[PDB]
Amino acid sequence: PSCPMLCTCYSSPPTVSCQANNFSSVPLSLPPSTQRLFLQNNLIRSLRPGTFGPNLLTLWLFSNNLSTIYPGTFRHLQALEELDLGDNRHLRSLEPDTFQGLERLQSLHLYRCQLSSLPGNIFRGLVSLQYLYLQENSLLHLQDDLFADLANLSHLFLHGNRLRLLTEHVFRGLGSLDRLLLHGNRLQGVHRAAFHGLSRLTILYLFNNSLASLPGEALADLPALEFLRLNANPWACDCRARPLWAWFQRARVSSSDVTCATPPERQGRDLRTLRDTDFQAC
Numbered sequence: 001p002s003c004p005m006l007c008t009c010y011s012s013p014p015t016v017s018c019q020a021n022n023f024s025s026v027p028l029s030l031p032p033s034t035q036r037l038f039l040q041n042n043l044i045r046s047l048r049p050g051t052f053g054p055n056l057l058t059l060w061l062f063s064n065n066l067s068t069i070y071p072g073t074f075r076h077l078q079a080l081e082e083l084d085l086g087d088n089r090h091l092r093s094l095e096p097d098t099f100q101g102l103e104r105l106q107s108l109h110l111y112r113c114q115l116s117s118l119p120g121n122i123f124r125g126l127v128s129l130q131y132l133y134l135q136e137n138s139l140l141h142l143q144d145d146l147f148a149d150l151a152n153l154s155h156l157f158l159h160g161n162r163l164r165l166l167t168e169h170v171f172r173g174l175g176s177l178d179r180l181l182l183h184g185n186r187l188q189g190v191h192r193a194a195f196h197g198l199s200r201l202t203i204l205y206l207f208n209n210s211l212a213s214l215p216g217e218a219l220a221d222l223p224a225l226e227f228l229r230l231n232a233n234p235w236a237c238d239c240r241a242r243p244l245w246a247w248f249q250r251a252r253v254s255s256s257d258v259t260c261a262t263p264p265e266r267q268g269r270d271l272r273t274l275r276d277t278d279f280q281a282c
């Protein structure tokens, strides 16, 4: 059985290229030796157990039409290092054990799949994961401990969702994280301890959200921070600004503008142009 129907196969490494055939299902008779499987740009609707072989290292399923990944689909892909399920606009939800088995996975792409929520334990056990792309879904909340096992995660992209709050332990377990992108949500509130333990984080984007203030304790929990983007938020330059203002007095970081939206008498000024005297009556 040497190459799946309408695909092209290569031997070093063992690769099966099945891109752009308008397939409705994953082709049959995948050689067990296959390490790279390229199924992007098809119209595949469902995935089931018994479809993928155990030697896969790379599996690209982006730009398909997936709506259901049945239980057990990925369970025996112990070796898998990269899984891209991005751009499946009707996917919508994932069952809680979808990634069980994938303890060697290093990159997981879930961008643009209409996810509105995730199971709280969906990323459990993904101890190898270094890159997780969840941008441009419709996510409304993230639970505490949603990433708690992801000790090696370096990039977490959550921009372009519908998040309103970051809770106390939403980022617990992310001790290796280097970049956290949360721009283009609707964030209104960040818990004072939401960034606790993010000791290696160097880049934080929070621009284009609905933040009127941010707690001073939270920036202080980012000792490694190098670049912060805070622009396109309705910053309140009243007594609420004092902790962020104070942090910026000491901070050595690159930053965007932090433009006051309110009160009218400070609208348009940068929050760093305020002086100690402006906060004396707080």
Ligand SMILES: *[C@@H]1O[C@H](CO)[C@@H](O[C@@H]2O[C@H](CO)[C@@H](O)[C@H](O)[C@H]2NC(C)=O)[C@H](O)[C@H]1NC(C)=O
Pocket (backbone or CB within 6 Å): 043, 045, 065, 067, 090
């Ligand atoms: C892409 O997947 C979507 C969602 O499963 C399909 O839209 C469903 O299509 C059937 C028509 O056969 C309807 O019963 C459902 O109302 C549709 N659901 C939604 C949410 O639109 C669509 O047919 C699929 N297209 C291809 C080419 O695979």
Ligand SMILES: *[C@@H]1O[C@H](CO)[C@@H](O[C@H]2O[C@H](CO)[C@@H](O)[C@H](O)[C@H]2NC(C)=O)[C@H](O)[C@H]1NC(C)=O
Pocket (backbone or CB within 6 Å): 160, 161, 183, 184, 185, 208
């Ligand atoms: C601010 O962020 C939002 C994402 O919430 C951006 O908005 C919308 O953004 C685009 C249209 O301008 C489209 O790509 C989307 O279909 C639409 N999405 C949502 C969820 O509303 C908006 O562009 C961002 N603004 C800037 C200047 O970056």
Ligand SMILES: *[C@H]1O[C@H](CO)[C@@H](O)[C@H](O)[C@H]1NC(C)=O
Pocket (backbone or CB within 6 Å): 021, 022
């Ligand atoms: C798949 O490929 C064609 C031709 O390039 C594309 O335009 C078409 O819409 C796709 N097929 C189906 C069945 O929709």
